[PDB]
Amino acid sequence: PSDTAKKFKVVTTFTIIQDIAQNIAGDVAVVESITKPGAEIHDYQPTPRDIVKAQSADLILWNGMNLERWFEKFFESIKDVPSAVVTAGITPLPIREGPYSGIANPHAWMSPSNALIYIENIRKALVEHDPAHAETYNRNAQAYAEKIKALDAPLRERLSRIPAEQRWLVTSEGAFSYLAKDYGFKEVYLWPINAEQQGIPQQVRHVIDIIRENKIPVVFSESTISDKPAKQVSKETGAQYGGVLYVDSLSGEKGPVPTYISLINMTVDTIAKGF
Template sequence: MRLGLSPWRLELSITRRKFATLAAALSVLVALPQLAVAAEPGKPFRVVTTFTVIRDIAQNVAGDAAIVESITKPGAEIHDYQPTPLDIVKAQSADLVIWNGLNLERWFEKFFQNVSDVPSVVASDGVQPMGIKEGAYTGKPNPHAWMSPANALIYVEHIRKAFVQHDPANAETDHANAAAYSARIKAIDAPLRQRLAAIPEGKRWLVTSEGAFSYLARDYGLRELYLWPINADQQGTPQQVRHVIDEVRKYDVPVVFS
């Protein structure tokens, strides 16, 4: 959605594509168990993730060395997903389960109690969480840590280590793929900063529906504005919508991402 409010359309249109590139590239531990459980010889290493971003990150690390599936489908509500019996079967048949943590998948811990002898990895382990600033989840960690390139590299490293531990036969492939994927993530940084530097500091706004980009806004010095902090909350109250409209008009924000 575009708001014809400013002459900065061209620069922000370019920047918008950069954000889309970053989101796609980043579209991704508590301690690993003491005993590593390796995949059975001759069988493909099977990985199940809680949602598609982590599936994409894991698939980039594994390449053709593993079968990676997501419990939730693209576009599905992640926060309050209702697992099915088939989801339990899928997780039970996996050699490794990867989840985000930071309270993103509020259903996962209870769900995983129904799965036995399958190791799991929290991809966000070690991330310095940002707190949610408003609403019912005030003070809780913002779970969208992968939107920071630096945090995305943490995700990649946790997944690489887990693959090497639980599927040592493909360790060389995992090392190489993780290095290549990390290089792609790092390559996003400089061009994005260069594009943003062309925009006056007071115009560097990131306006979205959900407050899912706080880590990205922090890393790149953007002022963040959103309708609601977590998608599971609501579709936006009249007060929230009015606040965003007023701020967009007040600061002459030319682009809204929704």
């Protein structure tokens, strides 16, 4: 097939988009993520090796919706490589309280129906910038979208033993708003979006309140942030610590969450197991 031939190179900001894009690209392009699995993605601090990586790319993809607060500054260091957001056509859910009230929640990929839009935007970008391989990108995008569509029934079935009134999803970052909307959960979080911020101790008390009044049985944390506030809530309440949920990062390839599909599956399975 050729060990020497330089393939079209895509660099993504973080691992979820890398894996979605690699499924669309197949063996016709190579996709690499800037952030490493487990690394916090909202306020990531790029290195000089990161600049070298993106400079080597033919196309740079990012979430937008101000997810990657570092990206626009990072992109100043890149010359003559185009960049594209992958969330065009996504309906934002706003953050509802605090100093980020009204800012778009950037975690749109946790809705599998939204992931179809991610796939379409990535397909368009790949076809635009590497048109010689359009048939491969289109074939692959269609087959991957069908895989994602086929998740809806098993995911809903996996959550089907939790009656509507009990469907409370208590997490650390409020990163699950789109998933909660899709599957009919009421979200509760310890902070509305990852950031250096005040007010988490106050919110811990508020969440203990909500847990106690609704007798919610489980609370979670996520793979790139601290599990201490979540475990503070579980200690003070009848709720068990059920975490860890995956949203901002895949695991390593040898870890429990190597792919975007595995991420959606593991997050849903862990929620269901909590109940």
